[PDB]
Design a protein around this ligand. Structure first.
Ligand SMILES: *[C@@H]1O[C@H](CO)[C@@H](O[C@@H]2O[C@H](CO)[C@@H](O)[C@H](O)[C@H]2NC(C)=O)[C@H](O)[C@H]1NC(C)=O
Ligand SMILES: *[C@@H]1O[C@H](CO)[C@@H](O[C@@H]2O[C@H](CO)[C@@H](O)[C@H](O)[C@H]2NC(C)=O)[C@H](O)[C@H]1NC(C)=O
Ligand SMILES: *[C@@H]1O[C@H](CO)[C@@H](O[C@@H]2O[C@H](CO)[C@@H](O)[C@H](O)[C@H]2NC(C)=O)[C@H](O)[C@H]1NC(C)=O
Ligand SMILES: *[C@@H]1O[C@H](CO)[C@@H](O[C@@H]2O[C@H](CO)[C@@H](O)[C@H](O)[C@H]2NC(C)=O)[C@H](O)[C@H]1NC(C)=O
Ligand SMILES: *[C@@H]1O[C@H](CO)[C@@H](O[C@@H]2O[C@H](CO)[C@@H](O)[C@H](O)[C@H]2NC(C)=O)[C@H](O)[C@H]1NC(C)=O
Ligand SMILES: *[C@@H]1O[C@H](CO)[C@@H](O[C@@H]2O[C@H](CO)[C@@H](O)[C@H](O)[C@H]2NC(C)=O)[C@H](O)[C@H]1NC(C)=O
Ligand SMILES: *[C@@H]1O[C@H](CO)[C@@H](O)[C@H](O)[C@H]1NC(C)=O
Ligand SMILES: *[C@@H]1O[C@H](CO)[C@@H](O)[C@H](O)[C@H]1NC(C)=O
Ligand SMILES: *[C@@H]1O[C@H](CO)[C@@H](O)[C@H](O)[C@H]1NC(C)=O
Ligand SMILES: *[C@@H]1O[C@H](CO)[C@@H](O)[C@H](O)[C@H]1NC(C)=O
Ligand SMILES: *[C@@H]1O[C@H](CO)[C@@H](O)[C@H](O)[C@H]1NC(C)=O
Ligand SMILES: *[C@@H]1O[C@H](CO)[C@@H](O)[C@H](O)[C@H]1NC(C)=O
Ligand SMILES: *[C@@H]1O[C@H](CO)[C@@H](O)[C@H](O)[C@H]1NC(C)=O
Ligand SMILES: *[C@@H]1O[C@H](CO)[C@@H](O)[C@H](O)[C@H]1NC(C)=O
Ligand SMILES: *[C@@H]1O[C@H](CO)[C@@H](O)[C@H](O)[C@H]1NC(C)=O
Ligand SMILES: *[C@@H]1O[C@H](CO)[C@@H](O)[C@H](O)[C@H]1NC(C)=O
Ligand SMILES: *[C@@H]1O[C@H](CO)[C@@H](O)[C@H](O)[C@H]1NC(C)=O
Ligand SMILES: *[C@@H]1O[C@H](CO)[C@@H](O)[C@H](O)[C@H]1NC(C)=O
Ligand SMILES: *[C@@H]1O[C@H](CO)[C@@H](O)[C@H](O)[C@H]1NC(C)=O
Ligand SMILES: *[C@@H]1O[C@H](CO)[C@@H](O)[C@H](O)[C@H]1NC(C)=O
Ligand SMILES: *[C@@H]1O[C@H](CO)[C@@H](O)[C@H](O)[C@H]1NC(C)=O
Lengths: 996, 138, 49, 49, 149
């Protein structure tokens, strides 16, 4: 019988306080929503540790036995409660299946409406116990909910437990290795958890380290099709190799005349030779002797001779001495083995066996040509300073060991190149095409898909290679057809989420994967590590970008919420996640004709917003303190690397000073600290929210929203201008802009009434200035209301300031990464430097320290190089901000869409963390009407054109009007100018042109 | 195929062609107005008079020469087709963005054939030929 | 370690012996002879200009 | 503490304008870099001499 | 001191090559920082293990130099594009972009050459000697409002 585990069985992983934090940890845990066995008893397996529970208030459940034999034959745990105490012992006990109530000992210790919970696990010889108590109402199943179990007991007793039983409603489950994300509150209790492998949303929560995720698409994983089967393809040789004639023959050669045997067309078994005790050495080079049976070769050459026992040291690559110089040399990149033994009884004899003698790589020459000891005419004949080239070994069996004869076999291997022809003893399999498989062609191992091919190998060619050396096609050794290899299908895995705030559903995209490969592979119905079973969630759909699982395809085309790729988007709708081809927008046939114009009859003022970065957090690094932790031994090694721990400080000093330049270039545009008048008769425009609030530093109201909505060896440094100095500059800029127009940008500020300044801002966009005064209250109300909406927009969402937030988040991520890279081993024995200094002699310790120096130096260069790139990216924004302040704030830019959308009027800066915010104010025309139009008018045969503005008719009368606001005027001469007669102009019309 | 991949662009080229078409259709029927607000239609020879004022040439100069001006424009777009049709090296900037990435990937892939001082550039050789304690070093 | 040990307000649970930072750096300890919680700070360092 | 510059109450009202009555032509230098030293290095001869 | 920008372009290239040349003298853990010592004192099997440390250290030194020059070249290109723009707009024209072609209302500018750079002489009108007046946005005549053209 079984029951759902829900979220039960989490326990405190370590005796560490952590608070207000989400922490990621790997341990033996009960997986969420697993099946727990139920009981009302037998012995049970213990496995890799147990979660245990019971509903109780009778207290019939009294203890446990843990062990292997449960009684007598070995030490076994007894854990019992007797109401006086909890009791533990480990004895070779003397009790039956149930010695309990009617309703050595090398260690011992002493200390329904409710449920008891426990966890038992056993690691490093320590047996550990965790616990909880709770009230409950539900008796019929485990209480669905959460509460972390806390440690009680931790004991060095070391028993190899494989079974347990309860001593006399109760429940059992098994722990398994998993990653969990845990939530610690302000008082450092665990209060929630995520089981990362459970589902795609749980992968996403663990990927982001968050218990909630926003709407979007997130990568969590990579998908690869697994090898379904294994193949061995070998030459089908029956013959076995002639090693007795190599190793055990009578005539092992004298060393200057060394013998070579070629081996070919046979199956070997090097393990038989390697396992033999007969050899005083079995040293090997580019192959380990354990691996030799798995390999295959074009040739083996056995080189054979007898030599004096102490001289065997010359038989290696790179050696020197008379045997190497004149008798037999190995090449200095020898691939194979040297095997030798004390052949004292075999090769020595009581006459001192004079049959043996000594005198480039694999040279042999038996020549009698004399060793001359000088430039004499020795002429090949013996004499003083003229000596025969061979000398005899005095091999008597009574010799001391270094003077006895030893036999030597050298095995030199020629690899698979041409068709392999000496081979290990391996079993060949059948060949299988089109599947993802492991394969082994003559010891050439790999994983992939095998198919037919059209590759015309020339008869000597055995396999093809790609640009990366990787084997691209193979001839099968048993049937000479050419097979293509191809790598098994793979891609990035991404989770589409509506926002956990909004829904729990998800869809999964297998990027670039064909759906036929997916739902019976690493996704579902086969070997499915972490990318767990749901072969369909309801629908499986092939997009251009990859296979998409669990989303509903739609034939409509909406706007895009979650973009997938190749014009596909997804969103959550009437409910399910849908997927569709996106629409670029509403289609609009513009109402064109050769004679019709639309003129706006009304406008809106609009206040937009634009946010720009201006400076990173400044930093400098004491690279000796960071790399070496103030250890003297490490500091002395770090001298050998020269100037690196100085050009790093020089680079970061360049970054640091440039931040104060960026801030000064953006804000210090103004020579004097202008201040606002006491009166506020700015024609009804209400700046109270953007001017300083003196009751606040003296920031504006909107600046106080912006400063709230954004929120070792490594030393941070302060900015030069303080946040109160930046607020003085944004105040001075704003006070100049209000009281004096652009004039404070061209030397001395000239005062002008604000309503007249706006009349000139209108006069810059081609709207005739009377249009402002005649609409002055309306315009002031539109502006005041628009400033009001900025407060609500900035109040509405945390996503409003994402640009400035990304300067903060990247600096924190970079520094945290640079700190966490202290803990990495880089292949050294430990990442804690004091281990290496304490556990090892200095000669070994240096090599380990040098890996940590190398890893930390490569980490620190990696950090500094990203700060250079990231600072260059911020400087492009600082130059843009200084430009927008020069043209928009200090002026009125005519550059289309530079200072906000619409025709530009003015803008106001407000300070913010690491950046600036501009409130660009723009005119937008808003209520158009169609009119008939003609490019000219003919009066007395003279063709008239308007001086400024355009001719229009309401269908009966003709007027001229300005291009951006309907205001019809009678066509007097003074609105117009003549040029020539009617006839050259297209579309000219007849009207009166009036003379004043 | 060595763990390298190429992802598709979000906007497919038949979507890009609808944006460049819309920008062009706005620019013909409505001048600059569709940047400043909702598009306002105007006759094209009347848009060109505003463009002439925008360079300080008086608008009567257009109408007094409209047939000539149209022919000069049409002729230039003819020469554009012959130039682009003729000279494949004209797109040298874009073609370098293609070529530079091809060399970047080819270098990254070819580096898998380097030894860096190991016994072999091919990882499965080492794993076939050597036992663990030595294979780690390589 | 090394640092300026200080008296602190931290509220460790009975089984917890020491505290860690957001970046996993050890930064508070229970004194094993008097079960109040201390706060650990590295000894001061800085560039000399 | 650095000074950002002299403070200035602009003499604003809803009915006062200031207009200039003279001018200066002024000539201002601006300096921009355009190119580095064109440099080349033999990576065989530097590393291996 | 006006030319501090151009002189700093000279100084950074001088410091970069000095740093690259100094690093030839660093051991990086080899028995000597002079390659012919290794080749004259040691036989090849030993020598290659020492030489490989110099090759590694000198190569990491050289990649560090080339990467900082790639970044500095892009940082100069941003200035070359700005100078090319100021020459097209300020010299070949009269820019209305406020504070672009020197402070004040821009009239014209002249180029002068300088080693590794360019110097612009921006000529500008700056108003002076201002007087207060009373002002009003419009004037009534015969009950109709008037505004200045
Ligand atoms: C070919 O012949 C030459 C002699 O003419 C051989 O030279 C010997 O090479 C070894 C190198 O290990 C030296 O120690 C000897 O001193 C050389 N001999 C003389 C007389 O100088 C050469 O090794 C031969 N090569 C082959 C492959 O057989
Ligand atoms: C121009 O648009 C504005 C709104 O942006 C119009 O003002 C509104 O007019 C209606 C009556 O027609 C009132 O109910 C609203 O309270 C007005 N709003 C404001 C902010 O005052 C204005 O009437 C339009 N002008 C013309 C000539 O149609
Ligand atoms: C300028 O606008 C602000 C709001 O943006 C006005 O301040 C509000 O005024 C009323 C009436 O005195 C108070 O009830 C509110 O509490 C004020 N709001 C805040 C947030 O303080 C201000 O009165 C306007 N002033 C002028 C001259 O128009
Ligand atoms: C075109 O505009 C003219 C002038 O605004 C309009 O003519 C006026 O029409 C009203 C009645 O709607 C008469 O009371 C006025 O006496 C007319 N004035 C003049 C100068 O004729 C005319 O109605 C408009 N036509 C259309 C088709 O809208
Ligand atoms: C504008 O009005 C004039 C008359 O005032 C029109 O000119 C006449 O057009 C007819 C038809 O082409 C000719 O037969 C007459 O000889 C013309 N008379 C004169 C005095 O030129 C003219 O066609 C009208 N224009 C438009 C565009 O309708
Ligand atoms: C202005 O220059 C254009 C050429 O750029 C001249 O246009 C040509 O004029 C001749 C007659 O002189 C016609 O045969 C051609 O067909 C015209 N070319 C085109 C493209 O139409 C124009 O005549 C010149 N105008 C003046 C006043 O000199
Ligand atoms: C396993 O658990 C699920 C609920 O999570 C349940 O439907 C299923 O029947 C259980 N299977 C067994 C064999 O207990
Ligand atoms: C409980 O066990 C202890 C020894 O562990 C023993 O002294 C005590 O008498 C027991 N209590 C009862 C009620 O039997
Ligand atoms: C007692 O322990 C020793 C080892 O310490 C072991 O040899 C012996 O068999 C044990 N006897 C019992 C009864 O467990
Ligand atoms: C556990 O098993 C090992 C052999 O696998 C044995 O050497 C050891 O003594 C056992 N320890 C205990 C306490 O049972
Ligand atoms: C945290 O502990 C304090 C006492 O140390 C207590 O006042 C407070 O209510 C606790 N808060 C939570 C969220 O447990
Ligand atoms: C060599 O001979 C001995 C017996 O003299 C035998 O044990 C050994 O296996 C033989 N080895 C080979 C390779 O024949
Ligand atoms: C060996 O290969 C040949 C050629 O394909 C085949 O005819 C023969 O049956 C094979 N023999 C064995 C024992 O595999
Ligand atoms: C989820 O977001 C929507 C707005 O997109 C909001 O209305 C809703 O209240 C949010 N869900 C929760 C649990 O508050
Ligand atoms: C996916 O694979 C099947 C064969 O398994 C093939 O018929 C289909 O055309 C493929 N589709 C794509 C888009 O690759
Ligand atoms: C969507 O279009 C396909 C053909 O392109 C069709 O098979 C499908 O039935 C359509 N769906 C609906 C709801 O009409
Ligand atoms: C202008 O007229 C056309 C029909 O001629 C109509 O489609 C369009 O909506 C009209 N525009 C306005 C603003 O009334
Ligand atoms: C406008 O277009 C119509 C139809 O194409 C044509 O009859 C008329 O002559 C044209 N008028 C002008 C001024 O181009
Ligand atoms: C240690 O002993 C002293 C008395 O000698 C006592 O005051 C103190 O509370 C004890 N601390 C602990 C943790 O037992
Ligand atoms: C303008 O200033 C100059 C000196 O810069 C002076 O000589 C000249 O007389 C002044 N002109 C007027 C009209 O005040
Ligand atoms: C204008 O008059 C005010 C006093 O009303 C005075 O403070 C200010 O300095 C005068 N400005 C000029 C340009 O004379």
């Amino acid at each position: 019988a079984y029951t759902n585990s829900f979220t039960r069985g989490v326990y405190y992983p370590d005796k560490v306080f952590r608070s207000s934090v989400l922490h990621s940890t790997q341990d033996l845990f009960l997986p969420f929503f697993s099946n727990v066995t139920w009981f009302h008893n037998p012995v049970l397996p213990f496995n890799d540790g147990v979660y245990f529970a019971s509903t109780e208030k009778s207290n019939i459940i009294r203890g446990w036995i843990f062990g292997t034999t449960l009684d007598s034959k070995t030490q076994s745990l007894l854990i019992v409660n007797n109401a006086t105490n909890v009791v533990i012992k480990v004895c070779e006990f003397q009790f039956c299946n149930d010695p309990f109530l009617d309703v050595n000992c090398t260690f011992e210790y002493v200390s329904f409406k409710n449920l008891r919970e426990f966890v038992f696990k056993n690691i490093d010889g320590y047996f550990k116990i965790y616990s909880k108590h709770t009230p409950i109402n539900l008796v019929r199943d485990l209480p669905q909910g959460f509460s972390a179990l806390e440690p009680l007991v931790d004991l060095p007793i070391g028993i190899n437990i494989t079974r347990f039983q309860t001593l006399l409603a109760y429940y059992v489950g098994y722990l398994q290795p998993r990653t969990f994300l845990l939530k610690y509150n302000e008082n450092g209790t665990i209060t929630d958890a995520v089981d990362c492998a459970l589902d795609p949303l749980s992968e996403t929560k663990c990927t982001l380290k968050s218990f909630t995720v926003e709407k979007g698409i997130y990568q969590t994983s990579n998908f690869r099709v697994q090898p379904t089967e294994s193949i061995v393809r070998f030459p089908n040789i029956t013959n076995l190799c002639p090693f007795g004639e190599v190793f055990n023959a009578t005539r092992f050669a004298s060393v200057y005349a060394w013998n070579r045997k070629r081996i070919s067309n046979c199956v070997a078994d090097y393990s038989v030779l390697y396992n033999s005790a007969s050899f005083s050495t079995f040293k090997c080079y580019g192959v380990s002797p354990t691996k030799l049976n798995d390999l295959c070769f074009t040739n083996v050459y056995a080189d054979s001779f007898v030599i004096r026992g102490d001289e065997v040291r010359q038989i290696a690559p790179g050696q020197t001495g008379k045997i190497a110089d004149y008798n037999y040399k190995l090449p200095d990149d020898f691939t194979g083995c040297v095997i030798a033994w004390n052949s004292n009884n075999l090769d020595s004899k009581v006459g001192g066996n004079y049959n043996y003698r000594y005198r480039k790589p694999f040279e042999r020459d038996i020549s009698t040509e004399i060793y001359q000891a000088g430039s004499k005419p020795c002429n090949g004949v013996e004499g003083f300073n003229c000596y025969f080239p061979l000398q005899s070994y005095g091999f008597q069996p009574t010799n001391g060991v270094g003077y006895q004869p030893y036999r030597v076999v050298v095995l030199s291997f020629e690899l698979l190149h041409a068709p392999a022809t000496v081979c290990g003893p391996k079993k060949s399999t059948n060949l299988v095409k089109n599947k993802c498989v492991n394969f082994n062609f003559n010891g050439l191992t790999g994983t992939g898909v095998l198919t037919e091919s059209n590759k015309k190998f020339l008869p000597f060619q055995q396999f093809g290679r790609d640009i990366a050396d990787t084997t691209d096609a193979v001839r099968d050794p048993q049937t000479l057809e050419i097979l293509d290899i191809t790598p098994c299908s793979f891609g990035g895995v991404s989770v589409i989420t509506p926002g956990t705030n909004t829904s729990n559903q998800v869809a999964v995209l297998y990027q670039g994967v064909n759906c036929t490969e997916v739902p019976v592979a690493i996704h579902a119905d086969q070997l499915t590590p972490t990318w767990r079973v749901y072969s369909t969630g309801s629908n499986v759909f092939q997009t251009r970008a990859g296979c998409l699982i669990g989303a509903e395809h739609v034939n409509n085309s909406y706007e895009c919420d979650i973009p997938i790729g190749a014009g596909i988007c997804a969103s959550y709708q009437t409910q399910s996640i849908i997927a569709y081809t996106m629409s670029l927008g509403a289609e609009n046939s513009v109402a064109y004709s050769n004679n019709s114009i639309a003129i706006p009859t009304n406008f809106t003022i609009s206040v937009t917003t634009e946010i720009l970065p201006v400076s990173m957090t400044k930093t400098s690094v004491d690279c000796t303190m960071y790399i070496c932790g103030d250890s003297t031994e490490c500091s002395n090694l770090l001298l050998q690397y020269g100037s690196f721990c100085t050009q790093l400080n020089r680079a970061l000093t360049g970054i640091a000073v440039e931040q104060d330049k960026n801030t000064q270039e953006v804000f210090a545009q103004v020579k004097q600290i202008y201040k606002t008048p006491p009166i506020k008769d700015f024609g009804g425009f209400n700046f109270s929210q953007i001017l300083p609030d003196p009751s606040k530093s003296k920031r504006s109201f909107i600046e106080d929203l912006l400063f709230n909505k954004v929120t070792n060896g490594l030393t941070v440094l302060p900015p030069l201008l303080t946040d109160e100095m930046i607020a003085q500059y944004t105040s001075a800029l704003l006070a100049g802009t209000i009281t004096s127009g652009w004039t404070f940008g061209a030397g001395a500020a000239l005062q002008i009434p604000f309503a007249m300044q706006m009349a000139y801002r209108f006069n810059g966009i081609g709207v005739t200035q009377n249009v402002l005064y005649e609409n002055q209250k309306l315009i002031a109300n539109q502006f005041n209301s628009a400033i009001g909406k900025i407060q609500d927009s900035l109040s509405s969402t945390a996503s409003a300031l994402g640009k400035l937030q990304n300067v903060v988040n990247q600096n924190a991520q970079a520094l945290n990464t640079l700190v966490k890279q202290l803990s990495s081993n880089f292949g050294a024995i430990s990442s804690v430097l004091n281990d290496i200094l304490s556990r090892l002699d200095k000669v070994e310790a240096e090599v380990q320290i040098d890996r940590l120096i190398t890893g930390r130096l490569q980490s620190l260069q990696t950090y500094v190089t990203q700060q250079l790139i990231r600072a260059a990216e911020i400087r492009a924004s600082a130059n843009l901000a200084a430009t927008k302040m020069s043209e928009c704030v200090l002026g009125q830019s005519k550059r289309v869409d530079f200072c906000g959308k619409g025709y530009h009027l003015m803008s106001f800066p407000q300070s913010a963390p690491h950046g600036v915010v501009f409130l660009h104010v723009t005119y937008v025309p808003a209520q158009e009407k169609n009119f008939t139009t003609a490019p000219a008018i003919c009066h007395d045969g003279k063709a008239h054109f308007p001086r400024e503005g355009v001719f229009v008719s309401n269908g009966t009368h003709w007027f001229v009007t300005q291009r951006n606001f309907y205001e019809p005027q009678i066509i007097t001469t003074d609105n117009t100018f003549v040029s020539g007669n009617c006839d050259v102009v297209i579309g000219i019309v007849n009207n009166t042109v009036y003379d004043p | 195929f060595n763990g390298l991949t190429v992802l598709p662009p979000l906007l497919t080229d038949e979507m890009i062609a609808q944006y460049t078409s819309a920008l062009l259709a706005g620019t013909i029927t409505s001048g600059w107005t569709f940047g400043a607000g909702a598009a306002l239609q105007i006759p094209f020879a009347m848009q060109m008079a505003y463009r002439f004022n925008g360079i300080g040439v008086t608008q009567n100069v257009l109408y007094e020469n409209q047939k000539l001006i149209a022919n000069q424009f049409n002729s230039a777009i003819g020469k554009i087709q012959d130039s682009l049709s003729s000279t494949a090296s004209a797109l040298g900037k874009l073609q370098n963005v293609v070529n530079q990435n091809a060399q970047a990937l080819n270098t990254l892939v070819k580096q898998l054939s380097s030894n860096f001082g190991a016994i072999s550039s091919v990882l499965n050789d080492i794993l076939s030929r050597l036992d663990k304690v030595e294979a780690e070093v390589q």
